Ligand binder design. Structure first.
Ligand SMILES: O=C(CS)Nc1n[nH]cc1-c1ccc(F)cc1
Ligand SMILES: [Zn+2]
Length: 402
């Protein structure tokens, strides 16, 4: 129960930039006290990759009206969870481990690359000839000397708010702009914990009885990262579009569930976002000045993000083939169903598929590995998804109140 097995092959992790300990000292750079736009006492945070920070704390920050961990009068509460430094260390290492698990698959390298290149658009100016950052897409990073530096980022992983098992991908809004739906994108905050997971039922083809299994937390995280991709490229479906469950939930799950969005509706969605991208090319084109760094250069960052073409003259435009390629990647190829296939784990078959929650600890290599998750090769857990079977692999799952 000692090594974490964070580097199965090679010398160093391939996505996460440091093997952090929660007690490592603050430096100006990738370990720092930070402040979110909205006040608060600064919180210790770790920069795991360009544009991506992890805050090993319960989320009492991103919502003015959720500033406390106590229950109101399918959910789970524990006000003591993630209050000690040991737990915050375990949270950071568990999150690091899941990013490496995701990045060990071809699909996950594609997705995390798209996320990192998906910088929120500089649409903050009211002068249509000036690019400017939107400050809710930044954090304030304290330095060794005590001064603050403003830093753009794309993604924050943070612990859950009061309901420990409510995971979601949310972001700060703009008074006028709809950043998640106008091509712009915004910094995404994912509420998530690697220290709990969910159970579902499944019969594996001698009496043929029902099995009680647990969801692999790498799938759950990849689900939330897929939402983040939609939202970072500003092409999320309006949350007011629902079944009876939102379109955006069904699109993220993928598989046959996504086929319920009728194809004519998809085409309409695709055209709308094509036009949003065209508007962004135009805005870059009309740009004379930049507030807060070079005009033409920030111009290139967004040429890269949106895959825009440039003519001999210097003018940007949207290419239909490059647009269809990026949009299909983000909406059709990055899905939960496809991650299940790449990981080869058992998982709910449809987005609705239980009421069981389980405490887990994926940090020890003996419990869970980057390559195999719970289904450890060359043990009995390798077959029939025995590693996710909460009866067979009972030492890895503790059932909690529902
Ligand atoms: O269902 C949603 C929509 S983002 N979020 C959640 N709240 N608590 C758990 C989840 C969740 C998210 C993704 C999964 F793959 C499995 C469970
Ligand atoms: Zn979701």
């Amino acid at each position: 129960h000692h090594s974490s097995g964070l580097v199965p092959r090679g010398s160093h992790m391939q996505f996460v930039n440091k093997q952090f300990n929660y007690k490592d000292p603050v430096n100006g750079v990738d370990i720092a006290y930070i402040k979110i736009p909205n006040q608060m006492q600064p919180v210790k945070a770790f920069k795991i990759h360009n544009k991506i920070w992890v805050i090993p704390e319960r989320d009492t920050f991103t919502n003015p009206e959720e500033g406390d961990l106590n229950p109101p009068p399918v959910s789970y509460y524990d006000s003591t969870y993630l209050s000690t430094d040991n737990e915050k260390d375990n949270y950071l290492k568990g999150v690091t481990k899941l990013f490496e698990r995701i990045y060990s698959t071809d699909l996950g390298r594609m997705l995390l690359t798209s996320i990192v290149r998906g910088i929120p658009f500089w649409g903050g100016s009211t002068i249509d000839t000036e690019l400017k950052v939107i400050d809710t897409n930044c954090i304030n990073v304290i330095q060794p000397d005590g001064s603050y530096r403003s830093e753009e980022l794309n993604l924050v992983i943070i612990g859950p708010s009061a309901d420990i098992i409510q995971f979601e991908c949310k972001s700060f809004g703009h008074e006028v702009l709809n950043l998640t739906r106008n091509g712009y994108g915004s910094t995404q905050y994912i509420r998530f914990s690697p220290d709990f997971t969910f159970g579902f039922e499944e019969s594996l083809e001698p009496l043929l009885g029902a099995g009680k299994f647990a969801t692999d937390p790498a799938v759950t995280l990849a689900h939330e990262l897929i939402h983040a991709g939609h939202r970072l490229y500003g092409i999320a479906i309006n949350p007011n579009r629902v079944f009876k469950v939102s379109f955006e939930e069904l699109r993220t799950f993928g598989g046959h569930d996504a086929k319920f969005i009728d194809s004519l509706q998809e085409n309409e969605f695709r055209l709308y976002y094509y036009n949003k991208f065209k508007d962004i090319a135009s805005t870059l084109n009309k740009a004379k000045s930049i507030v807060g760094a070079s005009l033409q250069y920030m111009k290139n960052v967004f040429k890269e993000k949106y895959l825009l073409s440039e003519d001999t003259s210097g003018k940007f435009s949207v290419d239909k083939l490059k647009f269809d390629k990026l949009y299909k990647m983000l909406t059709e190829i990055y899905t939960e169903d496809n991650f299940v296939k790449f990981f080869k784990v058992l998982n709910r078959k449809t987005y609705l598929n239980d009421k069981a929650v389980f405490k887990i600890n994926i940090v020890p290599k003996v419990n869970y590995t980057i390559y195999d998750g719970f289904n450890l090769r060359n043990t009995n857990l390798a077959a029939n998804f025995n590693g996710q079977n909460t009866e067979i692999n009972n030492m890895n799952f503790t059932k909690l109140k529902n």
